Amino acid sequence: NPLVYTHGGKLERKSKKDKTASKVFEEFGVMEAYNCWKEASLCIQQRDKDSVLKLVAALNTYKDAVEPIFDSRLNSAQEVLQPSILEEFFEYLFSRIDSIVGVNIPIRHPAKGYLSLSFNPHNIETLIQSPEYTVRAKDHDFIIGGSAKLTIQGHGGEGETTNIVVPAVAIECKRYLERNMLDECAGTAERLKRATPYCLYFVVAEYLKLDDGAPELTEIDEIYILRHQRNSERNKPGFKPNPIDGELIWDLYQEVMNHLGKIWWDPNSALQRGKVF
Amino acid sequence: NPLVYTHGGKLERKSKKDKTASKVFEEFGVMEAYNCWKEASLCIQQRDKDSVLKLVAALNTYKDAVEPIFDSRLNSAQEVLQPSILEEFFEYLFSRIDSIVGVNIPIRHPAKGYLSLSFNPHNIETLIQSPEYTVRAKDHDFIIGGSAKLTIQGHGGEGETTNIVVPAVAIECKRYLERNMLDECAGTAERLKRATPYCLYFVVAEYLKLDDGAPELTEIDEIYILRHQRNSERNKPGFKPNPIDGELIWDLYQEVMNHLGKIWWDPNSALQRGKVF
Amino acid sequence: FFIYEQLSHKKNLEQKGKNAFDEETEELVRQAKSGYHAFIEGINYDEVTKLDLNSSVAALEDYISIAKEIEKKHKMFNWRSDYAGSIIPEFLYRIVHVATVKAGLKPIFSTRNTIIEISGAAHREGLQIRRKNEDFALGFHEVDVKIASESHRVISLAVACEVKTNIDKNKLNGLDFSAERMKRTYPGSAYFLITETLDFSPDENHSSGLIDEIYVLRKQVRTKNRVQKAPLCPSVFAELLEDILEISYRASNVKGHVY
């Protein structure tokens, strides 16, 4: 049961490197709001429906305090520390699964989810002696999974070892999602399902900025719209930004846990059942 | 410099299991024709243009003697031993490359050319402890390449090792090619180029049985039509079956050797050159 | 159109045959099918419970057992993937609940360009638009297409299936190839493969990617059991056919395009 602290680390990084930001952080109480949020999140230790809603409330409080400062008073923040808020939130929510799942999960944070291996030999002698190979992986905002160590030895016997991460759930977190970002995901999804067919893949957005006509839902498991609002509303008459929806975080928590709770690949279970996944 | 003897082994297999065939082999001198061909092929030791043509002549002689017996006197022969003739012929032609290439190639015969690796975890504990993975490979009629040993260890430290073959040239050999078999190849080609992008892929046919309108040549490197004849000619007035064309075998021999003779993957050679392959 | 691919096959075999026709009448084939067809007809929509799906499967085996023996006796030749190999690619061909439409058992695969000349390209450029004959297709709906005044009539599919007696490794590879093409044309579409018995020649496990499910109707470990003339006899199990509601569920889902 550990935490990586994605957002907090980046707040720590920024306060040494960017003295504009460092000054603004302390001046407007970014640090205090964060510490409140961090410790308030660590306080909720059971995982019934109600408990999760309490966790969501802590997230909403933090964003209300901190995001208006980022938007109006900093340049290098929108895609530098803002998106890591959701990333760290999910670190908290899933920090207590080892007990439930009944084994030590090493990966519950952003990491690179394995997609494929392919062989690119420099020359003929190379191919035969020990060929160079390449591992493609996608950066994901939040991965639950295990690590392994891939290895190739050629005719010349000296090994090539790469540290890879084979995911159970991969989650993308955006402030608002538009179609060129969805299409990024749509292409990931194909590749990720091929790498780990029983990997679950979610897209987590607060706002939707999608192109009218029917979006393909194809191959992405679920797409979350946590604030139930269109992005065009943000500048419209009588706008009030909705809170991140605790029922959908709860849905996600349940679907994850259900995914973790099942039997995934089983040749004999295919027979008797019929169906693979 | 070894040989696997694809066809000869299958002739040996058949003469113990199928007493109809065993009787027919000895009765009609299949064994003798083969031994003539085997030893006559081993005799041609230089690899200039002329030498290759001599090799091709030996192949044509053998097929002239043996294939009429197979067609008229045996049932379990057309897709049981006939296609292995071309397979063994290429074993001979390439049996003398170790000297030229300047290192020991382990694979110069039919084998399974690596396509992809993917992770299929039985459950969550499994994924974390040591996940089961799967290697897809395509049977190819003739592969020149090296072998390697792929390895995965999980949290529980105990290793999973699979023997894989990463190809330089993969060759398909058919008596006559029709479109559903080409489409089989067209799909292999995509996958094989992805596994080994500097793998060369040829389709070797004697006759063409293709569907009029423009075939896609896309992604298969070269397609060989060794007898320069349509399959519909085989039953037509004044038909004489053409010999396998030594100029095309020569083309193949040169293109292979050129492929083997080059530099394949090089990051610094990309810069200065511009182009990857 | 009321497509019974198999009964249309009977219409055709009886009409062209004569010897096959005398065989049908004496072997009670049309009757045997009618007995089977009527027992399923008893199973209606209200009766599409778990109990009804099993009752239908029982009747199916009665028929298929009698069908097989006529082909597998001394009567005689053209009886392969023609007759028996088209009994299971029909079943609950028509639903009731959603029942949007469909567009038949074939689907438009894709298109390529193949013009002779520069002048011909301006006049009307040659294309080659594919459509394979799959065992059974259920579609969402609907079109035709025109390309330079060349019109071709479009099927857009929700589900596709082949039905085979047994699956080996090398066939499974080619089946994988078919599915890649399918998914390219129609993103959302499910592809199923349905077989009775399984013959995985290498024990090596099989290609997950792009095949959206494979189903074993017999749940039978190996085909060889059945092939080997012996005590070993398979069973068409109703529970296996019951869990092919995945198709129905998916089809229904696409009708309701909302939030």
Next chain:
Amino acid sequence: FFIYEQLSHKKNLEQKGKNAFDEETEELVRQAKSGYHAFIEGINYDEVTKLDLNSSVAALEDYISIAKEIEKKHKMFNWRSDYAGSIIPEFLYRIVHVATVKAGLKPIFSTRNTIIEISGAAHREGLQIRRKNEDFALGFHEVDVKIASESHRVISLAVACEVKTNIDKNKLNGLDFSAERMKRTYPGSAYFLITETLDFSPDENHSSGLIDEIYVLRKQVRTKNRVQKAPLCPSVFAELLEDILEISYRASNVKGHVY
């Protein structure tokens, strides 16, 4: 159509601007381009030797060096991937040798179905047919398409390219995504990516599959060199632009459909 995407951009900037227009006249921009455009015009078809390709590149750098400085001074804002990022997506836009035709710098990506209602599906079903705006496209040729009396004007492409100043890892991934779609629509087609300088942020090597070539016009190891205000200055090397005959060769090959 004589498409200069960049000169049309000049036509548009001068027309809408006024302040930008006074800047063009004083900065000698149209003139500077005309000087450049005329020097290339000296390089004809007989002059498409190795020597001529280099002479053209020398003139190109003269112009692009002068173009950059006007945007990169105090004049002023909307001057990004508008003006500067459309000088290299033209060049040898017209050949001579084969010169079949083309079909512009955009290509029809693919199609999906999106109907509101069952009645609407029968009436005329809604589709969504894609077409991205790529930097430069050369096509084989030619069509339009109609779907239920909905007509859309078809480009079938031989080559496609983007031109960028610099390539990072995450952009390369999305560029890979674009190419998958492209290859699905048009099997044979080559996709190139062309950039001046390379910024591989992780040293980890890059995605071979579906990108048919990437070219570095500067052969410059890192962008940071140029970005870092310092002695370090790149060079647009003619030899790099010379080896983009791969495109011409491929296009020509498809014209002659024989044995």
